[PDB]
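Q: What changes when calcium ion is included in the input?
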Amino acid sequence: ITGTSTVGVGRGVLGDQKNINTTYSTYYYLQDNTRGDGIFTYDAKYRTTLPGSLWADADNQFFASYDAPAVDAHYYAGVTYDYYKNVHNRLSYDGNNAAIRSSVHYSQGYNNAFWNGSEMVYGDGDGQTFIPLSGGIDVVAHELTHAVTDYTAGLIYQNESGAINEAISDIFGTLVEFYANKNPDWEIGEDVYTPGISGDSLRSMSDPAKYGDPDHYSKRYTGTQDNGGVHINSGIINKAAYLISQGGTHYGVSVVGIGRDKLGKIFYRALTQYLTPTSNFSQLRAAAVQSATDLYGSTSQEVASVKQAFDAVGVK
Ligand SMILES: [Ca+2]
Ligand SMILES: [Ca+2]
Ligand SMILES: [Ca+2]
Ligand SMILES: [Ca+2]
Ligand SMILES: [Zn+2]
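A: The predicted holo structure follows.
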């Protein structure tokens, strides 16, 4: 909508107060004109027809519980935008400042969130398995990273390329959580998962096996469920990325950690320069090795650490 850029205030899903960039034209809309060609948040009104209505508010105050998921979707979209721009010199998901659109209140008790090819979509959860999914910065950045992957490598969402596509989203979702620096960790979705249970999440990158995911290639899932295990076999790549960043000894193989910024550089370069729609795990290892070589040199610690991390998870 055409109008002036304004600044509203509200609470997110977890009760935290924050400012949001809004647009004024009769009503105050969730439209942030300060990043690229806009970040726009919509109300799906418990339906599944998308995108719904651009979020409109009478007073620019967003403190109702109904407001909370939209406050977070909008705000964490802005944080993810800032991460890609400031850290990777990437302007929005297509690299050309595409408008970022998100809808909240999708369906009723919907325990999930996703990128549908064109926009972000967040359920409210059923209050038992999930609370509103946009309250998790790693969930928001995970799903927006799918948009990034769709415009770059284009990793097909099945089998190995699919598990890579998933891991890439867990990795950058986690790096975005660290960038924002509020209780960061190497698990996925903990802020919105199971309000009655402390310390759990959907997935762990540091210990995929915690939730039954493989942490080594010899344990890969080779069946047909979950598009050939895209959320299952990502554990193998997640563990390798965790090792590259943090270091550790995993099945007897020692890895020297090089830290989060370098992990982010190597994997962003792999994603955008080397990976293709059909890349398998072994091809990911070669892309990550070639990325690390471009960035730090072939004799570097960074290159040696990438080789060790993939060795540790059984990927040759
Ligand atoms: Ca209001
Ligand atoms: Ca966290
Ligand atoms: Ca997390
Ligand atoms: Ca929990
Ligand atoms: Zn995903």
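Observations recorded in class: The first helix runs from residue 68 to 88.
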